[PDB]
Every structure is written in C-alpha cells, then in structure tokens.
Amino acid sequence: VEVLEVKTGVDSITEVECFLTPEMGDPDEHLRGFSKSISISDTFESDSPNRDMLPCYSVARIPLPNLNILMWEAVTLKTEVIGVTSLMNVHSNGQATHDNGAGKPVQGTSFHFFSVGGEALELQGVLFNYRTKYPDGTIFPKNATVQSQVMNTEHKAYLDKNKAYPVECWVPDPTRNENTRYFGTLTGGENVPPVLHITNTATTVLLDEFGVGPLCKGDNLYLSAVDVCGMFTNRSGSQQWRGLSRYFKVQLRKRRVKN
Amino acid sequence: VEVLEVKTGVDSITEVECFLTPEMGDPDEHLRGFSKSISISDTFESDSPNRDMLPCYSVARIPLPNLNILMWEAVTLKTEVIGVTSLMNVHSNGQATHDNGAGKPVQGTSFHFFSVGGEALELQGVLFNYRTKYPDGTIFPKNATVQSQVMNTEHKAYLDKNKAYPVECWVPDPTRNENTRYFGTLTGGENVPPVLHITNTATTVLLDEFGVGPLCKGDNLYLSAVDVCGMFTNRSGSQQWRGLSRYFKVQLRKRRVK
Amino acid sequence: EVLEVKTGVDSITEVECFLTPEMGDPDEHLRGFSKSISISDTFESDSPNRDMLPCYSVARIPLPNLNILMWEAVTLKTEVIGVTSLMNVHSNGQATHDNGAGKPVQGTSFHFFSVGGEALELQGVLFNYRTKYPDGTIFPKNATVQSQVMNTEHKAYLDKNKAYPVECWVPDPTRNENTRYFGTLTGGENVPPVLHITNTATTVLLDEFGVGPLCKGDNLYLSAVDVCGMFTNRSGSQQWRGLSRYFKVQLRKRRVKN
Amino acid sequence: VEVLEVKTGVDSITEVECFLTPEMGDPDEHLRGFSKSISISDTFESDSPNRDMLPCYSVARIPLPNLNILMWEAVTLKTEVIGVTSLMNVHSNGQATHDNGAGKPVQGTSFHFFSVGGEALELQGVLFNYRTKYPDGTIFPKNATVQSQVMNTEHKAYLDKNKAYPVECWVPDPTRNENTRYFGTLTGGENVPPVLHITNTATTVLLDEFGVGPLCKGDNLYLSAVDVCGMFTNRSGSQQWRGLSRYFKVQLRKRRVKN
Amino acid sequence: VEVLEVKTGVDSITEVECFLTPEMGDPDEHLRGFSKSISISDTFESDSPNRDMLPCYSVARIPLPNLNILMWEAVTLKTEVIGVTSLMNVHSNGQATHDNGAGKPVQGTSFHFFSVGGEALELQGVLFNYRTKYPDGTIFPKNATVQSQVMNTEHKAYLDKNKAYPVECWVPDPTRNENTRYFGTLTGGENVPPVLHITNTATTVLLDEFGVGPLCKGDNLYLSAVDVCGMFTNRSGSQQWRGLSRYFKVQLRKRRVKN
C-alpha cells in the first residue's frame, strides 16, 4: 500500500465514540464484570480453569462510513476507565481489613491494555504452564509444548471474537500489528493498589514515525481492551477478578492509497 | 455556536476564588468532614448503605458579572486541598499501629477529583454491585440492572445538587462534558498513603486543542470536587472516610460567540 | 506598580542560612525530637502538650537597608541538612525483628519551605475541633465543627518561631501573593523517607509576570517544616524527628511606586 | 577505526527481528522458564548453587548480510518482554495469599536487562560472597578473593555463550562496551511487584553523542538480555525464579569505515 | 580567582575513569563490603557503635597531568553502581522469607551519593544522637552538644581521608562546596527495595549556570561516593549493611584562570 494525500473537507473527517465492556467470566446473572472465585490446582498437570474463572480480551469491530483507494486513517485516541469510583464500594460482602474495619477494596494483579487498529489485533501465545487444560468456548494455544512457557511461534491468533481469548494465554504479537497501535501495563503482586487517572484533556496520537495512523481495511475500526482492575475479596476470603469498561474516542480522516 | 474574538481591555478579565467543603457523611454534629463508621453487608442482596456512610460530590455554581453574544470563558485554574497538615493529628482516639505506638493516620482508598465547567458536570452511573439499595435523600442510578455493574446508558445525570450524588455510583461521563475540563485520581488499596502536594506557583491552563476554555452559560461557573483522603481508624478499629476542602482560583475573560 | 530592575554596583545580594526544626525538645538531650505520642481515648479529651507538637519554623532576615527601591527574591536553593543521620539504627531502636537492626525513622512526614517579602499567611484547619492546644502555642481560636473543613475566622501570620503547631495551620491560598510556598505531606505509618541532596538545583521565585517576592521593610521571610517521620524506641513509643533546612536566596534591586 | 559517511538507497538499510528466551535453569522437561526451587546454604563457605538453580544471561549472535569497507550500524531498538499476561495464572499449584484466596503471583527481586552491540557484551565480575562454589557448565569469576565482593579487575569476560554466564556473578563492564548500548534495572525486595509495559510505539535511539551507533564486526549483531520477572511460590512454599522471553527489532544502516 | 577561556586542541582534553570501593566496616577477612551485624544500644547515653559496624564515605584524590594559570575543569560525569546483580545471591546464609522460601534479598535503608570536585568534599556534621561515642580511627563531630542533633556550625571538615568519615555523622556542607557538584538520595524505611539502574548512555554535565565545571587545584580531582544498598539478613536474623563499588568516568579540559 502506497499512502498518499489526506483528503480535506468536512466530509473527510469522522469520529467513533464507544464503551468496551469487560469480559471477566460472569459466573452468575448478578455478577457481570466479575469472574468465578479462583480455585488453585494441586499440581501443574491438573491445572484446569473453567471459562467463568478466566478473564478474556474485549474487542469491538466498528463499521465506518462506506468509501468505495480511499481508507479511513485513525489519527487520535482519547480513552479512560469508566466507573473508577465504584472501587470505593467497601461495604458490600467484603472481608474486613481487620476487626471492625471496612472491606478490602479491589487490589492485586491488574492488566490495563488498549489497542486501535485497521484490522484485528494480532496475538502470540505464552503459557505460564503449558499443561494447563483451557476450557471449551475459549480460543487458546493448541499443541502446547514446554517451549510454549517462554516462546513457541506456532501460537499465532487474531483477536477476531469477543469473550473468547483468555488474557493469560495471549499478548499482542510484536512481530506484527504494523496496522495497530497497542498500549499495555501488567502491575503484578497480591496487594498492589489500583491507580486510575480520568480526564477529558489527554489525547494520544496514533500516527507512526512517518505521519501515518492505522488504515481501516473494509471500512472497519478495531478497538481492543482489557481492564482487570485486581481482585475482589468476599467475606469467605475467596477472590474474584473485577473489571471495568473502557471509553474510546477515535478521530479519523480519509487517506488516498494505491494498489 | 461559533466562537469569535476575545474582548480586550481591563474590564474584560474576572477572577473567581472559593472553597468547596467536602460532603463525607457528617454522622453527628462534631464530625463534619468524617463519614459514619463503615458497616459491611453480609451479602450483595442486603447491601444498604445509610446516607451518613456515603461520601458525595461537592459542587458550587458561582454567579459571574452579567453580559447582556458575550460569554465568560474560563482560562486558568489554581487548586489545592486545604488543611493537609490536619492529617498529622495521630494523637486523637486513633488505633495504635503497635503496642505503645502513635495513632494510625488517615490512609487507604483515596479519590481526588476537580472540574471547572460553563455548566453542571455530566455524570455516567456505574455500580460496584447493582442490587445495592441507595438511601433516601441521595440521587443515584435508577432502574439498575446487572449491566449497571459494567456499563448502562440509562444512568445519566447532571451534578446539579450538593451533598446528593454519592461518589461510589457516579463518574464524569466521557461521552459529554465538552464544555467542562475534569481531572481525578482513584488511589486504591487499604494501606496506600496520602501524597498531598501544595503550592501557589502551579497553574492549569483550561483551553482545548482550539484555544477555547469552558464558556459559562447563564453567566454561571461550575466547580465540582471530591477529596476523599483515605480512612481514619478509631481505637475500636472501625473506619471513617475523612475528606478536606479544595481551593479554586479561576481566571475568566470575555469571548464573543454566534 | 513594579518598575525597572537596577543594575551595576551593590545591585545584587545573597542570603544563606539554616532553619532548625521545632519538634518539641522534651528534655535538654532531645533537641529535634518530639515527646512520645500519647493518644486520647476520645475526640473530646484530645489535649496534646506543647512538647508533643511540631511547629512551623521561621526567620525574618534583615537585608541591606535601601531608601521606591525594594529587594526582590529571584532564585532559591534549598535542602534538608543531615539526611544521613537517619542511618543510626543502633541507638535505642525497636528491632525490626529478633536480632535485627533498629527501625529507621519512618511514617507521616511534612516537607515545606517558603520565601516571602512578608510573613507567610496561614489558614487554620483542625482534624478535631475539640482538641485542647497547649499554652505557649498559637492555634485556631473559637474553633467550631466547621473548623474541621474550613472556618474563615482562623487567619494568622507565621510571625513567631516554636509557636504555630504544624497540625493546625496551612498556607492560606486566598493570600500569600508576596510569598512562594511548596510543601508535601506523605502520610502513612510505614511510609519510607525519600530525601534528595544536591547543590546543582535552583528554584525560580518569579511569577507569570517576571516578579518575585518584594521585601517590605527590607526583610526576607524564610519558613520551613521538615518532620522526617517518627523514631520508634525499644519501648514502642514514637517521637517526631525533624532536621534543619538550608536556604540560599539571590535578591536584586527593583524600583516600585506608591 | 575512522567512521565516515552513511550509504543511502533502498538497499542501504536492513532490519533484525527476533526473540531471546530466558535461561532460568529449566530444572526438568516441564519447567522451561523456571529455576530449581531455591536452597539456602547454612554458611557462606557452604554456598554451592547448582546449575539448574542459577539464572544466566541470554545471548544471540545474529549474522547480517555480508558486505566486504562498510559495516552495519545499529540505529534504533524496539524491545518488550513477551508474555507479561502469563503472570495472571494464579490458579496453578500456587500458595494461597490467605485461607480461600487466589495463588500468590510472581513477585520479589527482578532484573530486566537488554543490550545491542557490534560485538559480545563486556562483563565485569562481582560476587555477593567470594567463596561461593559455582557449578560445572557455568562460566564464572575464577581466582576469587575477598576483594571480588567489591571490585577485582581480574574478573573480565565476553558474553559469548548462552545458558552459561550466571546473572549474579557478572555485570556490564563500564570501562569497556564502547561498541554496545546496555540498559538494566535491578528491583530487589521480597514482595516487590512486577511492572511490565508493552507498546509498539516506543523506539530507543542507539546513536552516541557523535551520531554513531554500534558497528557490527564480522557482520554480526549481538543481542543480550535478562528478564527474571520475580519468583513463583508453589503450594509447598518453595520458590523458583520465573523468566520471560524478550523481543528485539533493530534498524541497521550501512556505514563506511577505515581500518 | 577570575575564570577566562577554555583551551582547544587534541591535548587540551583528558579523561579519568576509576572504581571507588565501599567502606562498610569489613568485620572479618571474608566480608569485604559488609559491615559488622548491627547492635542496638539500650539507651542514647550508651550508643557506642564500633568502627567495623559504621559505613564511611569513600574518597579518591586522582592526580591529573601536570600543567604549570591553567587548571583542569571537570565537564561531564558518567557513574554507575558495579555488581547490582550480586543482590540476586539469595541462597547464601539468608533468613528465609517464609517456610521453604528463598532468602530475603538486601533491602531497607539505602544512601546512594557521588560527588566530583576540584578540592575535597566539604562536610557539615549532624548527629542523630549527640551522646553517641564514635570509635577510635574514625573522624566525627567533636565537642558535640544537643544542638549538634539539628545544626552545630562547629562541625566542619574536608573529606580528605578514606574509610574515616562515618556516613551517619556527615553530609555535604551546602554553605560551601562551590568547587564541587554533589548528588545524593537517602531512601529510608526498614523493608525499602533497592532500585538500581545501569546504562552506558547517561551523562551528567558538571557545568554550573555560568558554564564553569569544577577547577582542580594542584592538578588533583576528588571523587567521593557512598552506596549503602541496604541490609543483609543472615539466618540468625542479625543484619549487616552491604555496599557496592561505584564507577566514575570524568571528561576534563584546560581552562585559563588568573591570581
């Protein structure tokens, strides 16, 4: 693809605003945005997590105004976590900090990740434990070998399905994603406190070093997200992953391209 | 509504200064700035927080001088939390950290938020637990379903009343607030320590990509805030939200529109 | 009305001094420490003795007398003197654990410094409006429940050393036009002290309009607090430990009218 | 060596992309990416860590296109740790935080290190304890004295062999490496939480203050790495180092050189 | 002294590169770089720390090429801590984290400090406890009074001797050191994790606001360092300061000067 002039004019600019909801497991009809209580396998060879216990990658494919050599180019992203203040509900079935204290807030291992792309995010598989049996209804590395625990190039996938790609198996494939801009932070640890900033005054630019943003094949924008905030501890002491939705505002413009 | 020239002169500039006091619960007439002690429901279904245990958003609507095409445009903000040294009272009915020790100071989950707009801050409701019964005298997401636990578009509101909107079920609506600038931080975890900076040498510019600040409809500036500093632990080991007031200094200039 | 800067001979001056911390000094051997912290059982019975209360430090520095012409503070260099003293973990310290070293000074800290052409101006805010502050100290008077968020009666001048309890007072952001102040409260019980020393860093004291503090009556006001944290003795009791602050201030001569 | 002009033209540039797997010990045929569980010595004299217990430096020598006097010059690096989300597997033979809680995630002492050079990374030896007996199959400071605990200049080597230079015995030698760019953080502490950022938008510049990058002797790129993420605690409470692979992408341009 | 022009020419440039070893106490002939295990006085009046238990400032007077009006002027500094990876030896007489665990790594109170100067570092004395009996063969504030615990102007010295000036009594005197540049962080707390960055791509400029670096009186350069990394806990539970060597590379140039 030869990228050429940006079209000028008011019809040359569009905008995509949406919410991408989390996919944490949802173990009952009252617990959307939570996973199942975590159960620990006794051995590696018996690691067998259920689907309702495994957070997955969120993805939304957004149709843009049809164009046809012109493609929509993603220029600017605005994004934030929606419902940060909900993590102050410290009075609903929380294990106490101590005797007569308030609930433990959501804390621990967090993954905050977001991508904007002209095609599906491209994933590479890395397994904590290759012998883990992943559940029916999820898409995960197949023919896992020991070498899957560090790097196995057989484990390529597209983020082509919502509620399907377990977070713990897949990362953005850094050998691809030319047409995607991705951003991710894992903050590990049992007690790591969530630090969530919100503002409507921060724009991130999506143009590569040559002034070129993601170009939207078949007039589709791809928004992908993960926002595992940490773990909710109930009074029994068992722990659930808790997630929040992510806001996306992408500005786009029309680029001419050849071949 | 198109934005044109900024009126110049010495009669074209105005300044708004004020304090927004925190609204933490005030469970008795000696505990202004504190909440009622947290009680934890045994289940989600039975979660029923009383008003005096629910911190709420602070809001002040300030009349500006009248202009009748001319609107007040907000340009610069100075803000800080007032009384940060108050958190050094570790000698007043606080649980000792160990045998013979000084008092645990205010710590744990904090929310520091401020916003300046030309209209009321626009809110999206999101709930930790959708079956939570919120109390009489508070304004909260109505018709909550399990989708409210992640994203429910029904839950829209304007921060149009003080001591009314509980911090825990409302957040600035990113899909709106085009005529407001907002900034907040949630610092979670039960041990996390307060980090409070203060200076009269720091200025936030309020203008957008296009050099335009909030334009004050009806000649009213709207200041909104939340300064939940953490929890204070009394010798019983029960915990109360403690908040502080926030200072605002806003500089406004005249703008012609339409 | 601020006019031209004078240039040439005797046009420049420097002020270099140290300000000692003011922590309580509870016996002739413990300068720079508070008394051990006693906790009151109730808010009602909170009665901290002067030797348990850290206070604001201040120095009125007299400048070369001028006769329309006044001194203008332009840059600051500052640091905490004797940071390495906090490596003494062998002098009557509660052991971390069995056979271990003494617990270092840690927990709640307040690092503040200001340079002004008049007394730093203070706002009173109280953790607990019922606290009885001791004779010999200057504290918010006629305290009410509203004093726990913002009571405009509590106004004062940092005009005396060892008198203004840190926990009652903050810089008043509605005034202090003729001062630059900077402060950090790092609260928490385990919070580690982080202290940077260098002779390579310079703060600029000029405002947005290129004007620094102007020294009324030819007097520079330096103000400071450096409560580093608490020292735990082998008994478990905790004292505030403070350290001295170094100020270097470059001033120039500014003509002024009316 | 006199560094002259850069050749231009579409064939004057090349790109190196690869993965560097962690060398953590691999104690059995199922635990690639893990160390052997740590065994403490009663005394400094008895300190005798086995090879399967000692994380080593990763190194890849990468042959570039032959030139016959031109040398390849490394200009830009893109790197990230691959599989950061694998550390969310807190349900596989993990010691519980507390009664009913999730597995403890990987946490504790981490070393994150990467270097790009036109020759093997140059190593200085420093020993926590000079009387440690290092194992057959590893290459370590020889003729240790007590001064090896602070600085002994006998302890020089080239990172010229994978799975062999123990990470705790060697460090980049700052008196050499004129022809290498190295970056490393040690975050020690027993409870220290991992912090892993991913993005395809960040580029390191490899040029020195004179606009010259590493020049590749015999047309070879040297990529060195260590990504000890922390330790994994099984249900017995014994602890293994857990390592992850590192992605490199280096842009190189042809430089003319004399002698 | 009037400062005039920089000299130019290949021979107006010189470079000083060297290691500063730590002076932690060296309690026995196997523990270079450790202190003696810490003992706590029952009272202030009885504080009497032994020399093998007190870390001291490190210093090196480096002779420069003899110039006979001309002085060498220090312009740039590269510095790093050497053997940061040595803090991953958690298998050598360390107190376990918990039952079956790896050893506690080095952690707790750290002081990292370095200075480059045209004369000896000037020290101000500050004592935690003015009644402390400092030991024979160390240089300490003398005729100490209670005022010595905050600020006593009597306590002035030159860091003119190695393994002599105990760290806890002395800090750079900020009323002096015009001809030195100093940099120091105290990170206190008992459990504080070491964060140690290494790279050969960072340079510090030693030039003040007027473009003048340290001027080396009598053709001498003064390099001072402290790098107490934290505390080592042996299986006893007793604790020793552990330090590491610091690397210095200083670029100097000739400067004319009058009187």
Q: Which of E151, E244, E156 is nearest to E196 (CA)?
A: E244
- The conformation of residue D93, written as its DSSP 8-state character, comes to S
CB atoms within 10 A of CB C97: 13
Q: What residues contact residue E28 under an 8 Å CB cut-off, 6+ apart?
A: none
CB contact under 8 A, E183 and C195: no
Cα separation, B8 vs B3, in Å, equals 15
- Helix, strand, coil percent content, chain A, rounded in steps of 5: 10, 40, 50
Measured in degrees and rounded to the nearest 5, phi and psi for residue B218 equal 60, 10
Cα separation, D38 vs D42, in Å, equals 13
Q: Compute the half-sphere exposure of residue D156: CA atoms within 13 Å on the CB side of its CA.
A: 7
| B24, B76, B90, best to mutate vs chain C, most C CBs in 10 Å | B90
User: Cα distance from D112 to chain A (closest Cα, Å)?
Assistant: 15
Burial B36-69 (b: 16+ CB within 10 A, else e): bbbebbeebeebebbbbbbbbbbbbeeebeeeee
Minimum CA–CA partner of B175 in chain A: A17
Q: What residues contact residue C113 under an 8 Å CB cut-off, 6+ apart?
A: C76, C78, C181, C182, C183, C222, C223, C224, C245, C247
Beta-carbon pairs below 8 A across chains C and E = 183
- Strands, E assignment, chain E: 2-6, 13-20, 58-63, 70-82, 110-117, 122-125, 156-158, 170-172, 180-187, 195-199, 204-205, 220-233, 239-243, 245-258
Distances (CA, A) of D86 to C48, D26, D90: 53, 17, 9
Cα separation, A183 vs A172, in Å, equals 9
Given a contact cutoff of 8 angstroms between Cβ atoms, the answer to whether E39 and E53 are in contact is: yes
Beta sheet of A122-125, edge-to-edge order:
A156-158, A122-125, A170-172
> E178 by DSSP, 3-state: which?
coil
Given a contact cutoff of 8 angstroms between Cβ atoms, the answer to whether E6 and E254 are in contact is: yes
D147 and chain A in contact, CB less than 8 A: no
Given a contact cutoff of 8 angstroms between Cβ atoms, the answer to whether A46 and D91 are in contact is: no
Minimum CA–CA partner of C206 in chain B: B201
Q: What secondary structure does DSSP assign to E155-169, as a single string?
A: -EEE--STTTSBGGG
Alpha carbon D103 to its chain's center: 28
CB atoms within 10 A of CB C221: 24
Minimum CA–CA partner of E80 in chain D: D174
**Which experimental method was this entry solved with?**
X-ray
Amino acid at B100: N
B44 and chain A in contact, CB less than 8 A: yes
CB contact under 8 A, C182 and B198: yes
Measured in degrees and rounded to the nearest 5, phi and psi for residue B95 equal -65, 130
Alpha carbon C138 to its chain's center: 15
CB atoms within 10 A of CB E159: 24
Q: Which of E149, E188, E233 sits opposite C104 (nearest CB)?
A: E188
Which residues on B lie below 8 Å from C230 (Cβ)? 102
What resolution in angstrom units was achieved for this structure? 2.8
- Residue D52, both tokens: 């399967």
Minimum CA–CA partner of D208 in chain E: E201
Minimum CA–CA partner of B209 in chain A: A201
Touching partners of E (3+ C-beta pairs < 8 Å): C, D
- Domain chopping of chain D, boundaries: 2-259
Which residues on C lie below 8 Å from E43 (Cβ)? 92
| CA dihedral over D170, D171, D176, D181, signed as positive or negative | positive
Q: Which of A117, A179, A169, A105 is nearest to A139 (CA)?
A: A169
Which residues on C lie below 8 Å from E47 (Cβ)? 88, 90-92
CB contact under 8 A, D126 and E83: yes
Given a contact cutoff of 8 angstroms between Cβ atoms, the answer to whether C35 and C52 are in contact is: yes
Q: CA-based diameter of chain D, in Å? A: 69
CATH code for the part of the protein at B2-258: 2.60.175.10
> D33 by DSSP, 3-state: which?
coil
Cα separation, C218 vs B94, in Å, equals 46
Q: What residues contact residue C67 under an 8 Å CB cut-off, 6+ apart?
A: none
| C34, C121, C170, best to mutate vs chain B, most B CBs in 10 Å | C170
CB contact under 8 A, E182 and C192: no
B32 and chain C in contact, CB less than 8 A: yes
The dihedral formed by the CA atoms of D189, D195, D201 and D206, expressed in degrees to the nearest 10: 10
A30 and chain B in contact, CB less than 8 A: yes
Cα separation, D165 vs E258, in Å, equals 54
Q: What secondary structure does DSSP assign to A13-67, as a single string?
A: EEEEEEEE--BS---STT-TTB------BSSSTT----GGGS-B-EEEEEE----
Alpha carbon A192 to its chain's center: 20
E236 and chain C in contact, CB less than 8 A: yes
Q: What residues contact residue C8 under an 8 Å CB cut-off, 6+ apart?
A: none
Measured in degrees and rounded to the nearest 5, phi and psi for residue D22 equal -75, 145
Cα separation, C222 vs C119, in Å, equals 8
User: Cα distance from A55 to chain B (closest Cα, Å)?
Assistant: 14
Q: Compute the half-sphere exposure of residue B211: CA atoms within 13 Å on the CB side of its CA.
A: 6
Q: Which of D38, D181, D185 sits opposite E102 (nearest CB)?
A: D38
| CA dihedral over C150, C154, C155, C157, signed as positive or negative | negative
Given a contact cutoff of 8 angstroms between Cβ atoms, the answer to whether C46 and B91 are in contact is: yes
Q: Which of B249, B239, B222 is nearest to B55 (CA)?
A: B239
E185 and chain D in contact, CB less than 8 A: no
CB contact under 8 A, D101 and A237: yes
Burial A160-195 (b: 16+ CB within 10 A, else e): eebbbbbbbbbbbbbbbbebbbbbbebbbbbbbbbe
CB contact under 8 A, E196 and D183: no
In angstroms, how far is the first alpha carbon of chain E from the final one?
6
Distances (CA, A) of D114 to A126, B164, D78, D219, E200: 20, 54, 11, 20, 12
> C197 by DSSP, 3-state: which?
strand
Q: Which of D127, D187, D180 is nearest to D155 (CA)?
A: D127
- Strands, E assignment, chain D: 2-6, 13-20, 58-63, 70-82, 110-117, 122-125, 156-158, 170-172, 180-187, 195-199, 204-205, 220-233, 239-243, 245-258
Place of tokens 């020790």: B101
Partners of D171 in the β-ladder: D124
Burial C9-18 (b: 16+ CB within 10 A, else e): eeeeeebeeb
Cα separation, A253 vs C202, in Å, equals 46
> A255 by DSSP, 3-state: which?
strand
Measured in degrees and rounded to the nearest 5, phi and psi for residue B35 equal -100, 165
> A2-259 has which fold?
Polyomavirus Vp1; Chain A (2.60.175)
Place of tokens 């940077």: C196
Partners of B239 in the β-ladder: B233
Determine A/E contact with 3+ CB pairs under 8 A as the test.
no
Which residues on D lie below 8 Å from E34 (Cβ)? 149
Q: Which of A89, A93, A191 sits opposite B42 (nearest CB)?
A: A93
User: Cα distance from E30 to chain C (closest Cα, Å)?
Assistant: 21
User: Cα distance from E121 to chain D (closest Cα, Å)?
Assistant: 23
In angstroms, how far is the first alpha carbon of chain B from the final one?
5
On whether the C1-258 domain is CATH 2.60.175.10, my answer is: yes
Minimum CA–CA partner of D108 in chain E: E105
Cα separation, A162 vs D99, in Å, equals 34
